[PDB]
Amino acid sequence: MTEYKLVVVGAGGVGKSALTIQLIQNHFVDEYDPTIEDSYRKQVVIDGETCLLDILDTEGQEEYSAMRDQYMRTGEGFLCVFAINNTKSFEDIHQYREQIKRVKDSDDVPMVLVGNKCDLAARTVESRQAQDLARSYGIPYIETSAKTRQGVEDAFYTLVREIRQH
């Protein structure tokens, strides 16, 4: 079956690990902290075709690591995650998209913009803001909650669709 290397990026605390854990383990655990910055494998059926998702859950690295750039470079599609209650994390999306563009040597990498923690009423980033940005980038925008499961599988499956139709 086709394997898809998916990479999850974004500021610390936005829910990258929780999104991955929801997809892989089908639960949400407050404040859980993975211990490996590892990859996760899941066999899924998307639009009738079985495939293997290989998910890289990134941690924040503030300096230069050629190894970390090479792990990113193996990725075929990227989730750019911010949290809808965290204005700073939305402002950070630009630097993550620039990083992917640099390491992939391409401006048009399969990508989905993800606004996580949509269960929280205390929104500071309006959906229209992210919709505008996603449309400027030419990529889908999906709102998720790793806590309630809303949008989680759709974010990953939409990313695969973006790879398939790239």
Ligand SMILES: Nc1nc2c(ncn2[C@@H]2O[C@H](COP(=O)(O)OP(=O)(O)O)[C@@H](O)[C@H]2O)c(=O)[nH]1
């Ligand atoms: N309410 C809510 N909390 C979340 C959600 N996703 C993650 N969290 C919590 O936000 C904190 C940071 O999440 P984490 O997965 O470690 O973010 P990461 O640093 O991007 O990997 C943790 O306490 C999570 O339990 C969500 O969708 N809704």
Ligand SMILES: [Ca+2]
């Ligand atoms: Ca944490």
Ligand SMILES: [Ca+2]
């Ligand atoms: Ca596009």
Ligand SMILES: [Mg+2]
């Ligand atoms: Mg994490």
